[PDB]
Amino acid sequence: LDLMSGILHCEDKDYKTAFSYFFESFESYHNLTTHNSYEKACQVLKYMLLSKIMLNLIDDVKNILNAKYTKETYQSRGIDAMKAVAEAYNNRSLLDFNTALKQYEKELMGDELTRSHFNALYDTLLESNLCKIIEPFECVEISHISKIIGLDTQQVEGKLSQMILDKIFYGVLDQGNGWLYVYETPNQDATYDSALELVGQLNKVVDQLFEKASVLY
Amino acid sequence: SQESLVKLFTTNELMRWPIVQKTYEPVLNEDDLAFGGEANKHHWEDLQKRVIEHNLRVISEYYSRITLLRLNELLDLTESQTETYISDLVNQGIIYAKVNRPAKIVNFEKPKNSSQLLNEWSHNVDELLEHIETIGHLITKEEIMH
Amino acid sequence: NFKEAAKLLVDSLATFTSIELTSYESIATYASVTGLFTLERTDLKSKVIDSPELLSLISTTAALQSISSLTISLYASDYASYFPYLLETYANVLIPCKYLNRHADFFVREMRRKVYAQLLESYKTLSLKSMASAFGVSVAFLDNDLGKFIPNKQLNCVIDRVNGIVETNRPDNKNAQYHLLVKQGDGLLTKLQKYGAAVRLT
Amino acid sequence: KMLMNLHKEQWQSGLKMYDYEEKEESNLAATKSMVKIAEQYSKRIEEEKELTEEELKTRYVGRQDPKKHLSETADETLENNIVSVLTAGVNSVAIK
């Protein structure tokens, strides 16, 4: 019961509830008899490490670890993965994660929940680093972003196109010089918007007037 | 002895590292628990950062626009160093800036809307009319004098 | 006009009661068509990709399948795979339908307009080859399709054939909001005149 | 004459323009408020055309008159903004 809820609130993206539920199921699975609860202690444990990585508190990934149940009783490739990704999100190094999931690929393929949260994780990580670079910069080359961010030149240009569409900086990428302009400018004014409504009102009113004048004709 | 070092950073003048280094080299680099001790030998190296970060305050206020190529002379840095130190310093909130990567111009500025610029322009006008009224009173007054 | 259609039919996914009214897989297909037409990214993604109702119904038949894959590709900016899905949508969805046989021509033409216009919003400059390659067409063929769509305008672009770029003009600022108002006002002035001459005659 | 007079810059207070933040405020409020009294104006004239004038005005919100009130606001904000344009055009050219 707790397991199911654990996965589902984790997916809904609340990692405070997930961690509590997956702590509860850790107590049950670990200490009662094993028939498949070997496999299910091991899996709940990996999702406990994952939840902390999303919060960006990575000391708690390390507090959970110890060779008493985490590198002793359940010892998997998956344990090494989680601390690798943990270091990488904290560092702000998307390159470290990219190396990490390459060599922990077999953990990744086998679990659905990890795979969903390592996508969530990739895009949240990419946006936070990307910001840092383009906040004190304008007219900045795409090659220059790429070195810092850990990505190919193209991969950067492709991603940048999507950030504009979400409107998280709403700029334009100029591809013929490779420069990125960030525009935070208001292109909107209050008077003008309210004026479109005011005029709108009068058009409806003039139809209503026309009926009353029908008698004259 | 103390007064000459502290005085430099209470003013908002320009200053340059190879010069500041030399001045205090047989005064305070020869006093331990300041610069030139052991752990303090590795803080003489820190003094460099302080001079730069103070200079950027001055330069932002004073230059509304300056070339980068000029900026790297001033701070006594090369291009790689100079961009890093402006970027960190924009985040901290002391200055607000935009830096261009091809090697064009680095503009230091604070945002100013249409409404804001005009407000200043309202105040100028009001103040000019107060100036003229008091001037008419002292002319009348001169007729009494002579 | 589909503006009304979307509104009624996205709701008709949730609760449907059917007495001489056509199948629930049939109603789902129609709803995806009307979603695309009306709404833009942010809204679209909620309504017709994240519906619980469509996600429980899956795809098993051709018609539903092609329409569905097209919709995710408009959102997800895979423009490569967009045109094979677009072409599938012409044959299997628009034309065998009674209520879209006459709106098939209009719907595909619009679709070509939107996808290229989305790309343009994220760009100030592109190159001709990059742009063409993504679509999976030729530069020559691309200039030709742009050259029907631009006069009427939803793209908001020009093409410099000479420097080899595609350049993008932006009239969105206060300029845009001024143009919106003067035109709406031009009509109010026409109507006021028109009724007024008639009573002044009486 | 002694009572009628005022300051030495009261006869020299039309050159004293206002801060334009405040003038923007004046622009913004008047347009917004008129949308809501206009809405009120639409409801009033949907009916109100059977017999007995006072009754109809009691029924369809013809008392608490929005027709009168919409005109009033418009005129009021209209006379202000003619002088504000006048002020700016004088001060820019005159001084410099």
Side-chain angles (χ1 to χ4, degrees), chain C:
Chain C
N1 180 260
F2 298 126
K3 294 316 187 191
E4 198 36 72
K7 297 169 42 178
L8 302 163
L9 287 173
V10 73
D11 290 2
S12 288
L13 307 170
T15 293
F16 183 54
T17 51
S18 50
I19 300 171
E20 209 179 65
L21 272 165
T22 186
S23 300
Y24 185 77
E25 183 167 63
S26 297
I27 295 295
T29 311
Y30 303 159
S32 286
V33 167
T34 62
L36 288 162
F37 192 69
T38 58
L39 302 164
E40 297 301 281
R41 321 175 70 256
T42 297
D43 319 271
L44 184 69
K45 168 65 167 167
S46 298
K47 301 296 182 301
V48 293
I49 328 168
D50 299 331
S51 192
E53 307 292 275
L54 298 181
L55 294 170
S56 280
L57 186 56
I58 65 165
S59 301
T60 43
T61 197
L64 197 58
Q65 208 178 277
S66 304
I67 196 65
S68 81
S69 297
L70 182 61
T71 309
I72 294 156
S73 46
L74 186 63
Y75 188 72
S77 299
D78 190 346
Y79 294 118
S81 295
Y82 184 82
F83 284 107
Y85 293 149
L86 195 58
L87 292 188
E88 294 165 57
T89 59
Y90 201 83
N92 312 305
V93 182
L94 306 165
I95 71 181
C97 185
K98 301 186 71 158
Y99 310 112
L100 296 168
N101 186 243
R102 309 190 290 165
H103 323 89
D105 310 295
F106 174 61
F107 186 68
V108 75
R109 190 205 63 167
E110 180 41 47
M111 287 324 278
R112 296 194 282 233
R113 275 173 188 209
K114 302 209 180 82
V115 78
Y116 283 166
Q118 200 192 137
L119 186 62
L120 292 168
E121 180 68 34
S122 54
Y123 281 111
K124 202 187 175 60
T125 300
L126 320 84
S127 294
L128 284 160
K129 198 61 192 172
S130 192
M131 173 167 211
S133 73
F135 302 151
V137 290
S138 311
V139 289
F141 306 162
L142 181 59
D143 288 356
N144 172 79
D145 296 288
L146 295 164
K148 308 186 232 293
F149 312 160
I150 294 172
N152 301 98
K153 208 182 280 304
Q154 182 173 308
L155 300 163
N156 301 55
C157 52
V158 281
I159 313 170
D160 306 337
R161 195 169 188 150
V162 181
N163 294 260
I165 55 163
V166 182
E167 195 179 271
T168 289
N169 72 88
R170 208 56 53 111
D172 298 317
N173 48 295
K174 208 158 176 189
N175 182 248
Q177 288 185 297
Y178 181 58
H179 297 345
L180 292 169
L181 195 76
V182 278
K183 288 180 199 298
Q184 199 184 95
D186 186 67
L188 190 70
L189 284 177
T190 292
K191 298 182 166 311
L192 281 159
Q193 287 178 99
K194 184 196 285 163
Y195 297 149
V199 295
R200 287 154 187 164
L201 170 54
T202 325

Side-chain angles (χ1 to χ4, degrees), chain B residues 43-55:
Chain B
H43 294 357
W44 177 235
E45 285 179 310
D46 301 350
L47 204 59
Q48 192 174 346
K49 188 190 182 283
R50 317 297 166 195
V51 169
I52 306 162
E53 68 176 305
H54 169 231
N55 294 349

Side-chain angles (χ1 to χ4, degrees), chain A residues 113-168:
Chain A
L113 190 64
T114 70
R115 190 183 324 149
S116 286
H117 304 164
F118 270 20
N119 302 122
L121 187 117
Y122 202 98
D123 292 23
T124 57
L125 187 55
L126 191 150
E127 181 62 68
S128 321
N129 212 231
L130 182 56
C131 296
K132 295 163 187 76
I133 307 166
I134 59 176
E135 207 171 274
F137 271 78
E138 179 173 292
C139 198
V140 57
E141 281 149 18
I142 43 70
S143 303
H144 180 53
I145 305 188
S146 304
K147 310 190 184 49
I148 306 297
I149 198 158
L151 307 164
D152 308 298
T153 38
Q154 298 293 268
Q155 180 53 251
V156 166
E157 297 175 30
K159 284 298 194 159
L160 280 166
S161 299
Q162 322 298 289
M163 309 308 169
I164 294 176
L165 282 170
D166 303 343
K167 302 177 199 287
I168 195 71

Side-chain angles (χ1 to χ4, degrees), chain D residues 51-87:
Chain D
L51 294 186
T52 309
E53 295 207 284
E54 181 61 41
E55 293 196 51
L56 293 165
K57 282 175 175 73
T58 304
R59 283 164 309 162
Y60 311 116
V61 198
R63 306 307 292 186
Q64 318 81 78
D65 205 10
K67 184 180 159 176
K68 210 188 66 282
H69 298 189
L70 193 144
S71 312
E72 287 173 281
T73 298
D75 272 297
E76 183 151 78
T77 302
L78 177 57
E79 53 180 301
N80 203 88
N81 287 5
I82 307 154
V83 178
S84 188
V85 164
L86 195 69
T87 300

Side-chain angles (χ1 to χ4, degrees), chain A residues 51-151:
Chain A
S51 291
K52 280 301 185 196
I53 319 171
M54 314 312 286
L55 313 153
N56 199 39
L57 306 169
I58 66 137
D59 191 62
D60 302 294
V61 175
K62 305 173 194 197
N63 298 139
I64 293 166
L65 292 168
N66 41 22
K68 195 55 49 48
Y69 61 102
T70 307
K71 299 162 295 170
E72 190 172 76
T73 314
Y74 303 114
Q75 168 71 85
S76 188
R77 270 57 49 57
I79 290 306
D80 301 326
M82 281 289 151
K83 64 200 178 188
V85 169
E87 199 44 83
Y89 192 93
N90 196 87
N91 291 328
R92 295 295 164 178
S93 295
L94 190 48
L95 190 62
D96 199 75
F97 170 53
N98 287 339
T99 281
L101 65 88
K102 177 169 190 159
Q103 64 185 282
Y104 300 133
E105 186 51 48
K106 304 160 295 298
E107 166 271 305
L108 185 54
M109 299 280 206
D111 292 307
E112 192 52 81
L113 190 64
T114 70
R115 190 183 324 149
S116 286
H117 304 164
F118 270 20
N119 302 122
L121 187 117
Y122 202 98
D123 292 23
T124 57
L125 187 55
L126 191 150
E127 181 62 68
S128 321
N129 212 231
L130 182 56
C131 296
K132 295 163 187 76
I133 307 166
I134 59 176
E135 207 171 274
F137 271 78
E138 179 173 292
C139 198
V140 57
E141 281 149 18
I142 43 70
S143 303
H144 180 53
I145 305 188
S146 304
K147 310 190 184 49
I148 306 297
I149 198 158
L151 307 164

Side-chain angles (χ1 to χ4, degrees), chain B residues 67-79:
Chain B
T67 315
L68 179 58
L69 285 169
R70 182 65 171 149
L71 198 45
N72 305 345
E73 295 192 80
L74 312 175
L75 312 180
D76 315 87
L77 295 166
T78 42
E79 167 177 296

